[PDB]
From a paper:
Tripartite ATP-independent periplasmic (TRAP) transporters are found widely in bacteria and archaea and consist of three structural domains, a soluble substrate-binding protein (P-domain), and two transmembrane domains (Q- and M-domains). HiSiaPQM and its homologs are TRAP transporters for sialic acid and are essential for host colonization by pathogenic bacteria. Our study reveals the unique structural architecture of TRAP transporters and provides important insights into their function. Based on the above-described structures, and in accordance with our biochemical-, microscopy- and in vivo data, as well as with previously published results, we suggest that TRAP transporters employ an elevator mechanism for substrate translocation. Our structural data indicate that the characteristic Q-domain of TRAP transporters, whose essential function has been a mystery for many years, is central to this architecture, by representing a structural mimic of the combined stator domains of multimeric elevators.
Here, we reconstitute HiSiaQM into lipid nanodiscs and use cryo-EM to reveal the structure of a TRAP transporter. It is composed of 16 transmembrane helices that are unexpectedly structurally related to multimeric elevator-type transporters. An essential step for the successful 3D-reconstruction is the generation of a HiSiaQM-specific single variable domain on heavy chain (VHH) antibody and ultimately its extension to a “megabody” that allows us to identify HiSiaQM-filled nanodiscs during 2D classifications and aids in particle alignment. Residues 1–149 (TM helices Q1–Q4) form the Q-domain and these four long TM helices are inclined at a 45° angle against the membrane normal and form a unique helical sheet that wraps around the M-domain. The M-domain consists of TM helices 2–11 and the two hairpins HP1 and HP2. While the periplasmic side of the transporter has a relatively flat surface, there is a deep cavity on the cytosolic side and the elevator domain protrudes into the cytoplasm, suggesting that the transporter was captured in its inward conformation (Ci-state). The superposition of a VcINDY dimer onto our HiSiaQM structure illustrates that the M-domain fits to one VcINDY subunit and that the Q-domain of HiSiaQM structurally mimics the oligomerization domain of the second polypeptide chain of the VcINDY dimer. The idiosyncratic Q-domain of TRAP transporters enables the formation of a monomeric elevator architecture. The molecular interaction between VHHQM3 and the QM-domains is resolved in our structure (in the form of Mb3) and explains the inhibitory effect of this particular VHH, because it binds to both the elevator and stator domains of the transporter by forming multiple hydrogen bonds and a prominent hydrophobic interaction between W512 of Mb3 (residue 106 in VHHQM3) and P112Q, F111Q on the periplasmic loop Q3–Q4 of HiSiaQM.
Numbering used by the authors:
A (entry chain B): 35 to 46, 453 to 564
B (entry chain A): 1 to 616
The structure:
């Protein structure tokens, strides 16, 4: 039921953007989140962005060059990704993780998701 | 000796005062020490799980669960005995799929609270099976009293050997459990939804208590699958109890109890007796205007009726006025209760919508104006031809004397709405500071607060939030099938074939909600109708801000509507007189309620204006 925009491939540093587009639904309950998944999996992620404060959380396996932006009033959130290394490659999601205090990633994806999107970069 | 009978509940009380402690320190300390004691704010969330589910064990032990009863009034002595047995047996099936799903949660998880560098997260999930083992013994004990009282066919020993065998078949040969799927016999695909909803509504109207009936509906979808549902909902289930605004619900209920049991209502009444009563129609003016304060004291509609009733009846009686007019005005007094913080049903809608209580309460106060004002106008409209006598004069000496002596209590609503309205405090701490405030003034400015009274009040509050805890949790399992199988698009196809305007759906949905409001009580119906209709409303692009205040306002018409409307019976209970007196007493008061409902129904700009000006 959610809607997304962004993704692509990079010409022979660069950084794609992906975005969650509040299509139709409420999208400012004071959490939102983002994930990517492998062949044979659905338990992998970035961790929280906050509506207030400009607070940003990440897992340490993620620490580094992935980046965060939001506007409440045109309800629009975007992630931007600088690594461009093959381990980045997966199938991708934005998810309305809402009202669950404890976890960076667990199924706390209570109310919704985009059907996932594909992004890809590999050598020459 | 006597404590031995309820030790796990008194453990619940000892947890609960730990909550009250943690957060009174937290909110004042946050400001005054100018950096956050962050551990506290997260520790609170864990502690709430346990007291929440201890509350389920109370509602289990007492058999105080919410249900629909109508068929029991229709049904013969035997057919009852069977259906009672068949239902309660189906609940004995529930708790095993619960414990099985409990263990199949637990070894699947290995995630700590990294917001505090990870201490013992597994402790949340472990709570479910350990307290559910207590629920198992409590539940079998309760049904033994049902059979001793001839309600049912079967002895304890039946269920016990059943428990034994169900564990034993998992312990040694669960392939024979894999035989118990319907999957060898079926072809549903998408039509599984319409089946699951049919059998759901049937077992609900059969009088299966609401939470367990939803658990049966949600497991009955498992029979249709070939797939994942075993993991997916299970982890969601207890971990959804973690959520923060729900912690406000216990403290608001506690605040209602302490404030009412202190006799403070008579002081707010005698303040109004001067301030408004010197205008003719005074009996009505005091009830109607003071109800904004009384609702701020009481936190739920029944607590306004049960608290105020003797005073307002005595005032009308001493005036020599008509008992049906008393019944009418006092029913409308209880309708004011839901408009105003504190309000349980509002907050439950906040949870099930996953929307913030701040942006809802600062909206809810606008219908706070409109209902109270139109009700005040109807009091005048009737009176100026009914021919009641004119009220006494007043002067400042008695009026300000009454004000000083009341004044310490008068802050109570002005604390809870005011802290949110000014934006200095968020919902949870507003409830907790109100609890603190009501106790501390009540200890020293007044004297009836016994050392025991805090725990006595806490056990009621925690017990009632038990009912809530089951109902939230079970509803949020329903939030697997709905989002899984997209009921939204199939119900939309029926409407979407013609559907044009928000007004169309709003009035049609309000009509359904009203119609069920004739026949299923509000404290059940809320949980029945929100879970899927909130999505449908979102599919028609409705603002869930509006839809919360609109549908909770329908519940108020529901509690005001016979045959089901329990508040009508509460008014009869305090009124000592017939429901035929009540019905004509209420009869005109509904008209301004429906007008004010229609006014917001046709013109969203009213509810929009204050929240969107202050908040945007």
């Amino acid at each position: 039921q959610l809607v997304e925009s962004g993704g692509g491939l990079v010409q022979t540093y660069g950084s794609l953007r992906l975005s969650c587009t509040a299509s139709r639904v409420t999208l400012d309950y004071h959490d939102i989140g983002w994930f990517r998944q492998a062949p044979g999996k659905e338990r992998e992620g970035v961790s929280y962005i906050s509506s207030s404060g400009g607070s940003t959380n990440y897992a340490d396996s993620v620490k580094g060059r992935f980046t965060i932006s939001r506007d409440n009033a045109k309800n629009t959130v975007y992630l931007q990704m600088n690594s461009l290394k093959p381990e980045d490659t997966a199938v991708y999601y934005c998810a309305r993780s809402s009202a669950y205090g404890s976890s960076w990633l667990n199924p706390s994806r209570y109310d919704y998701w985009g059907q996932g999107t594909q992004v890809t970069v590999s050598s020459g | 000796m006597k404590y031995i009978n309820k030790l796990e509940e008194w453990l619940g009380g000892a947890l609960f005062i730990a909550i009250f402690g943690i957060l009174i320190a937290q909110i004042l300390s946050r400001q005054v020490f100018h950096s956050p004691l962050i551990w506290s704010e997260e520790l609170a969330k864990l502690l709430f799980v346990y007291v929440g589910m201890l509350g389920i064990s109370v509602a289990v032990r007492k058999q105080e669960h919410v249900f629909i009863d109508f068929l029991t009034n229709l049904m013969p002595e035997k057919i009852r005995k069977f259906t009672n047995t068949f239902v309660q047996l189906l609940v004995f099936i529930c708790i095993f799929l619960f414990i099985h799903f409990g263990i199949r949660t637990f070894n699947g998880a290995s995630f700590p609270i990294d917001a505090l560098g990870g201490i013992s997260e597994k402790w949340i999930f472990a709570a479910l099976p350990v307290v559910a083992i207590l629920m198992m013994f409590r539940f079998i004990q309760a049904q033994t009293l049902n059979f001793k009282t001839g309600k049912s066919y079967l002895p304890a020993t039946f269920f016990i050997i059943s428990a034994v065998i169900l564990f034993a078949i998992l312990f040694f040969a669960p392939d024979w459990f894999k035989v118990l799927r319907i999957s060898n016999y079926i072809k549903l695909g998408s039509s599984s939804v319409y089946v699951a909803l049919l059998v759901w509504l049937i077992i609900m109207f059969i009088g299966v208590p609401v939470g367990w009936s939803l658990f049966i509906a949600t497991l009955l979808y498992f029979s249709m699958t070939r797939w994942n549902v075993v993991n997916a909902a299970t982890e969601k289930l207890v971990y959804s109890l973690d959520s923060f605004p729900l912690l406000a619900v216990p403290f608001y209920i506690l605040t209602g109890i302490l404030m009412n049991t202190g006799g403070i209502t008579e002081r707010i009444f005698n303040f109004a007796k001067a301030l408004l009563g010197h205008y003719t129609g005074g009996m009505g003016h005091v009830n109607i205007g003071a109800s904004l304060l009384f609702s701020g004291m009481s936190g739920s509609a029944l607590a306004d009726a049960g608290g105020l009733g003797q005073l307002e009846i005595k005032a009308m009686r001493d005036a020599g006025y008509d008992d049906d007019i008393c019944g009418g005005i006092t029913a409308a007094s209880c309708i004011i209760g839901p408009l105003v913080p504190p309000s349980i049903a509002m907050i439950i809608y906040g949870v099930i919508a996953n929307e913030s209580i701040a942006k809802l309460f600062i909206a809810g106060f606008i219908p706070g104006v409109l209902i109270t004002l139109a009700l005040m106008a109807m009091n005048y409209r009737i009176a100026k031809k009914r021919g009641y006598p004119r009220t006494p004069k007043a002067t400042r000496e008695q009026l300000c004397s009454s004000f000083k002596q009341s004044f310490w209590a008068i802050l109570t609503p002005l604390l809870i709405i005011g802290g949110i309205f000014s934006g200095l405090f968020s919902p949870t701490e507003s409830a907790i500071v109100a609890a603190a405030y009501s106790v501390i003034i009540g200890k020293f400015v007044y004297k009836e607060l016994t050392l025991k009274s805090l725990f006595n009040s806490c056990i009621e509050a925690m017990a009632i939030t038990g009912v809530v805890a089951l109902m939230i949790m079970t509803v949020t399992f329903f939030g697997d099938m709905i989002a899984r199988e997209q009921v939204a698009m199939r119900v939309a196809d029926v409407f979407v074939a013609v559907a044009d305007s928000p007004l169309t759906v709003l009035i049609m949905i309000n009509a359904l909600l009203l119609f069920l409001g004739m026949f299923i009580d509000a404290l059940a119906l809320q949980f029945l109708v929100l879970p899927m209709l909130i999505p449908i409303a979102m599919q028609f692009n409705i603002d869930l801000i509006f839809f919360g205040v609109m549908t909770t306002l329908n519940m108020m018409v529901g509690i005001l509507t016979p045959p089901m409307g329990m508040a009508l019976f509460v008014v009869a209970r305090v009124g000592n007189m017939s429901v035929s007196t009540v019905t004509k007493g209420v009869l005109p008061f509904l008209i301004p309620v429906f007008v004010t409902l229609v006014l917001i129904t046709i013109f969203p700009q009213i509810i929009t204006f204050v929240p969107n000006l202050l908040i945007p």
